[PDB]
Scaffold this active site. Sequence first.
Site, mmCIF file in Angstrom:
data_model
loop_
_atom_site.group_PDB
_atom_site.id
_atom_site.type_symbol
_atom_site.label_atom_id
_atom_site.label_comp_id
_atom_site.label_asym_id
_atom_site.label_seq_id
_atom_site.Cartn_x
_atom_site.Cartn_y
_atom_site.Cartn_z
ATOM 1 N N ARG A 192 -5.810 20.846 -1.320
ATOM 2 C CA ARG A 192 -5.807 19.912 -0.185
ATOM 3 C C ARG A 192 -4.394 19.785 0.354
ATOM 4 O O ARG A 192 -3.551 19.302 -0.307
ATOM 5 C CB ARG A 192 -6.356 18.550 -0.650
ATOM 6 C CG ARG A 192 -6.433 17.419 0.402
ATOM 7 C CD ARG A 192 -6.611 15.988 -0.239
ATOM 8 N NE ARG A 192 -6.735 14.885 0.751
ATOM 9 C CZ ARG A 192 -7.730 14.843 1.584
ATOM 10 N NH1 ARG A 192 -8.629 15.777 1.514
ATOM 11 N NH2 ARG A 192 -7.868 13.887 2.453
ATOM 12 N N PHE A 207 1.972 15.246 5.905
ATOM 13 C CA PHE A 207 1.629 14.283 4.895
ATOM 14 C C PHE A 207 1.971 14.766 3.496
ATOM 15 O O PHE A 207 2.952 14.293 2.934
ATOM 16 C CB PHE A 207 0.181 13.832 5.084
ATOM 17 C CG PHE A 207 -0.335 12.864 4.079
ATOM 18 C CD1 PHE A 207 0.475 11.962 3.427
ATOM 19 C CD2 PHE A 207 -1.665 12.789 3.859
ATOM 20 C CE1 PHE A 207 -0.102 11.056 2.563
ATOM 21 C CE2 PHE A 207 -2.210 11.840 2.974
ATOM 22 C CZ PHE A 207 -1.414 11.008 2.306
ATOM 23 N N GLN A 244 -1.497 18.711 -2.162
ATOM 24 C CA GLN A 244 -2.058 18.250 -3.404
ATOM 25 C C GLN A 244 -2.646 19.339 -4.219
ATOM 26 O O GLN A 244 -3.319 20.226 -3.688
ATOM 27 C CB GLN A 244 -3.092 17.142 -3.136
ATOM 28 C CG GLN A 244 -3.819 16.557 -4.338
ATOM 29 C CD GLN A 244 -4.817 15.425 -4.026
ATOM 30 O OE1 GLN A 244 -4.745 14.915 -3.000
ATOM 31 N NE2 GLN A 244 -5.731 15.184 -4.937
ATOM 32 N N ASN A 247 -4.817 9.780 -7.819
ATOM 33 C CA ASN A 247 -5.717 9.011 -8.711
ATOM 34 C C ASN A 247 -6.931 8.509 -7.940
ATOM 35 O O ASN A 247 -6.971 8.598 -6.707
ATOM 36 C CB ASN A 247 -4.893 7.856 -9.393
ATOM 37 C CG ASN A 247 -4.475 6.806 -8.447
ATOM 38 O OD1 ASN A 247 -5.293 6.190 -7.752
ATOM 39 N ND2 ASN A 247 -3.193 6.538 -8.381
ATOM 40 N N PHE A 250 0.555 15.232 -6.041
ATOM 41 C CA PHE A 250 0.873 15.670 -4.690
ATOM 42 C C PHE A 250 2.381 15.718 -4.496
ATOM 43 O O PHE A 250 3.148 14.978 -5.133
ATOM 44 C CB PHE A 250 0.147 14.810 -3.622
ATOM 45 C CG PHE A 250 0.468 13.296 -3.641
ATOM 46 C CD1 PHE A 250 -0.150 12.519 -4.553
ATOM 47 C CD2 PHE A 250 1.318 12.769 -2.712
ATOM 48 C CE1 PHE A 250 0.115 11.115 -4.544
ATOM 49 C CE2 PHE A 250 1.604 11.385 -2.722
ATOM 50 C CZ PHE A 250 0.999 10.617 -3.668
ATOM 51 N N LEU A 281 1.870 4.242 -0.113
ATOM 52 C CA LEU A 281 1.343 4.580 -1.433
ATOM 53 C C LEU A 281 2.127 3.892 -2.553
ATOM 54 O O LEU A 281 1.759 3.976 -3.743
ATOM 55 C CB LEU A 281 1.353 6.099 -1.623
ATOM 56 C CG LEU A 281 0.504 6.837 -0.603
ATOM 57 C CD1 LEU A 281 0.631 8.326 -0.810
ATOM 58 C CD2 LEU A 281 -0.974 6.401 -0.707
ATOM 59 N N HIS A 329 0.376 4.759 -6.390
ATOM 60 C CA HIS A 329 0.511 6.091 -7.023
ATOM 61 C C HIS A 329 1.802 6.102 -7.776
ATOM 62 O O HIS A 329 2.783 5.637 -7.176
ATOM 63 C CB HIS A 329 0.444 7.193 -5.982
ATOM 64 C CG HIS A 329 -0.869 7.290 -5.298
ATOM 65 N ND1 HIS A 329 -1.840 8.161 -5.685
ATOM 66 C CD2 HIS A 329 -1.404 6.555 -4.292
ATOM 67 C CE1 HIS A 329 -2.907 8.029 -4.914
ATOM 68 N NE2 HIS A 329 -2.680 7.036 -4.088
#
Length: 165
Positions: free
Chosen positions: A55, A60, A63, A102, A113, A122, A126
Amino acid sequence: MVNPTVFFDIAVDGEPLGRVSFELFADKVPKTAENFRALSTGEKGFGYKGSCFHRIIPGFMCQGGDFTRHNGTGGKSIYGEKFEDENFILKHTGPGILSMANAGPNTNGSQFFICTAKTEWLDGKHVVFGKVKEGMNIVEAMERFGSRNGKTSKKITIADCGQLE
């Protein structure tokens, strides 16, 4: 002592792209850093070698770490079960941050990521545990194979990985 460094050699449709290395903040998040280090060396008999970045969302993050199901639904930590959010001392400050994926509080496994932007929303959600040291350009090259929904247009793999120094 000194924070560990690990590397990933990335391939695109099997063709070499380059090496990305990371400092792991074992001084702040020892439990989280050790998981990622051990999965990078493969010393427990499983880990990131051969796995893919499933992904990737340009602007951004990229991942990966789902070495068991290859799609975001798998992975496992070295601790025999998902593990806790160790702490949130470190923040998502900018490109190159390494943070755990997660599915809610205290559900860390092997997925992670690499940020390509500052992702401050985040913070506290995270756990940040490392940062790109060398090869941010390689991450920028990988990022170009992502898309809006995260599907990649070529297969992005960790051809090799390990610990440096």
